[PDB]
């Protein structure tokens, strides 16, 4: 299953994360999507840990969403990749 960390664009506007969404569900490829801001002004901390330790980040600055990873584990990064993936 691919993971897909993002934002729920009912709380967050996030086009890019619902193009990875619509991908995915596209190619019929089963994917879990992790939502790090589950409630307007609240983060969930031990998700973005999860996120950051993964990139190898010590700042959520900068971080780009989504952040997809591989059914493998590997990194595939935002939506233009994931795109890139299937081609």
Same mark, same amino acid.
């Given at each position: 299953?691919? !993971?897909?960390?993002?934002?729920?664009?009912?709380? +967050?506007?996030?086009?890019?994360?619902?193009?990875? !969404?619509?991908?995915? #569900?596209? *190619?019929?490829?089963?994917?879990?999507?992790?939502?790090? %801001?589950?409630?307007?002004?609240?983060?969930?901390?031990? *998700?973005? /840990?999860? @996120? @950051?330790? !993964? @990139?190898?980040?010590?700042?959520?600055?900068?971080? #780009? %969403?989504?952040?997809?990873? /591989?059914?493998?584990?590997? +990194?595939?990064?935002?939506?233009?990749?994931?795109?890139?993936?299937? *081609?």
């Amino acid at each position: 299953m691919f !993971k897909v960390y993002g934002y729920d664009s009912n709380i +967050h506007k996030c086009v890019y994360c619902d193009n990875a !969404k619509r991908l995915l #569900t596209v *190619k019929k490829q089963p994917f879990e999507f992790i939502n790090i %801001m589950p409630e307007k002004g609240v983060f969930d901390d031990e *998700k973005i /840990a999860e @996120l @950051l330790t !993964k @990139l190898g980040r010590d700042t959520q600055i900068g971080l #780009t %969403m989504p952040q997809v990873f /591989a059914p493998d584990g590997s +990194h595939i990064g935002g939506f233009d990749q994931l795109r890139e993936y299937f *081609k």
